[PDB]
């Protein structure tokens, strides 16, 4: 009878960049859902597939927990059927996903006087990724058709690039953490139940 | 109760072909990248082909570029390996691997192996 | 490619004390390694994935740790039923590499 630590995704001091989202797997927990739908200081809540009102008597094999960064208009997003760099490049989700998606304002821990440029995003690939892909490559973007020789020119360019956060931008610009819960149930343990 | 059974495994001359099947049950087997790995006699284990959850994208070894080829039909659920010119060093008990996690599961559509099958025995020989 | 390196290949060890086995790369995978036991004419089956993460069922003594280009696995309790050899796979870029193998014998 432990419950399930959500301080080591929620309550984290340090978050990771879009296009390097960070993964973890919570298993033999007495995980309560009420209490974090019922928290009132969350800005973004809403779940797929199952409906969050009451519903915490489910039993699932293992719980993934998925975090991230973004701006505030890239906040929609971050679901099913969506487009733009961040759903094209940087992080995608599949189109019969169910689990539930949080979002809250980080204005006062994730804004810096003068730019805060540790957050970064993929801007060009060749071709958009997969549900759950990760991609993390650094190799140049050939926009001509002529080689680049790894040199960063004319039609040559960095695929990454920082965003840049203040206190006094708009909610549009100013950062948001993202919290993905995705639930997976195989034919043995069922080990998340949480009574 | 997640099980992988497979089957096709023989005695073969060289030169000639052989096919290879692993069964599933106990996932959806629609939202999950396939791999094979050959153990060959007295030897450690070799990894052979991926392919991904939709079958867009399939990468076999070196070893046996241009020679073997993967696929699944997951209407069937089911995995499918077809070798061509076979050779002595293609003797070898087979594992069809299933991996953890699922669509890339994390990154690049590869990730750890979480079950396998039992494998099957595949001899050249004259 | 990238080549995967696992020395000794072997090992032995008795009862009761701590085990620690290493595997190296040539190239950066970051943390896209797997590690994989196997008993005589049995399947391998999965106990570390992610280098860090272990499995459901597994006891709860083993760790992985390690990032970059080496990474350590340890066992810190041995049982009558801890006796097989040991492999590490990397799943960063095709073509996956698994490792040479390491077997973990009796002392005597």
């Known amino acids: 009878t432990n419950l399930c630590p959500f301080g080591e995704v929620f309550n984290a001091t340090r978050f990771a960049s879009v296009y390097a989202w960070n993964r973890k797997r919570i298993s033999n927990c007495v995980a309560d859902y009420s209490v974090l739908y019922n928290s009132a200081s969350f800005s973004t809540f809403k779940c797929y597939g199952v409906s969050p009102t009451k519903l915490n008597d489910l039993c699932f094999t293992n719980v993934y927990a998925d975090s991230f960064v973004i701006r505030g208009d890239e906040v929609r997003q971050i679901a099913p059927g969506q487009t733009g760099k961040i759903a094209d490049y940087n992080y995608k989700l599949p189109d019969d996903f169910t689990g539930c998606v949080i979002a809250w304002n980080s204005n006062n821990l994730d804004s810096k006087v003068g730019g805060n440029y540790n957050y970064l995003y993929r801007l060009f690939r060749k071709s958009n990724l997969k549900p759950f892909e990760r991609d993390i490559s650094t190799e140049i973007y050939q926009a001509g058709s002529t080689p680049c020789n790894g040199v960063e020119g004319f039609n040559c360019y960095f695929p990454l690039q920082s965003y840049g956060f203040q206190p006094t931008n708009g909610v549009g610009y100013q950062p948001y953490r993202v919290v993905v819960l995705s639930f997976e149930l195989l034919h043995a343990p069922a080990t998340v139940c949480g009574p | 109760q997640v099980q992988l059974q497979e089957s096709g495994g023989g005695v073969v001359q060289p030169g000639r072909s052989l096919r290879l099947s692993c069964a599933a049950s106990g996932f959806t087997f629609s939202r999950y990248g396939m791999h094979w790995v050959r153990q060959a006699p007295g030897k450690g284990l070799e990894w052979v082909a991926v392919?991904?959850?939709?079958?867009?994208?399939?990468y076999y070894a070196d070893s046996v570029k241009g020679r073997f080829t993967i696929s699944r039909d997951n209407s069937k659920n089911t995995l499918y390996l077809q070798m061509n010119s076979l050779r002595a060093d293609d003797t070898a008990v087979y594992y069809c691997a299933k991996q953890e996690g699922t669509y890339c599961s994390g990154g690049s559509c590869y990730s750890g192996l979480d079950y396998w099958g039992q494998g099957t025995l595949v001899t050249v020989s004259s | 490619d990238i080549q995967m390196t696992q020395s000794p290949s072997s090992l032995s060890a008795s009862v009761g004390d701590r085990v620690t086995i290493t595997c190296r790369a040539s190239?950066?995978?970051?943390?896209?390694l797997n590690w994989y036991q196997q008993k005589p004419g049995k399947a391998p089956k999965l106990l570390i994935y992610?280098?860090?993460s272990l499995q459901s069922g597994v006891p709860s003594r083993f760790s992985g740790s390690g990032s970059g280009t080496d990474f350590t696995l340890t066992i810190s309790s041995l049982q009558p039923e801890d006796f097989a050899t040991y492999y590490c796979?990397?799943?960063?870029?095709?073509?996956?590499?698994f490792g040479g193998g390491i077997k973990v014998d009796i002392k005597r």
């Open positions: 796979q990397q799943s960063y870029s095709t073509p996956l590499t």
């Open positions: 992610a280098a860090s």
């Open positions: 190239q950066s995978i970051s943390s896209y």
């Open positions: 392919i991904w959850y939709d079958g867009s994208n399939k």
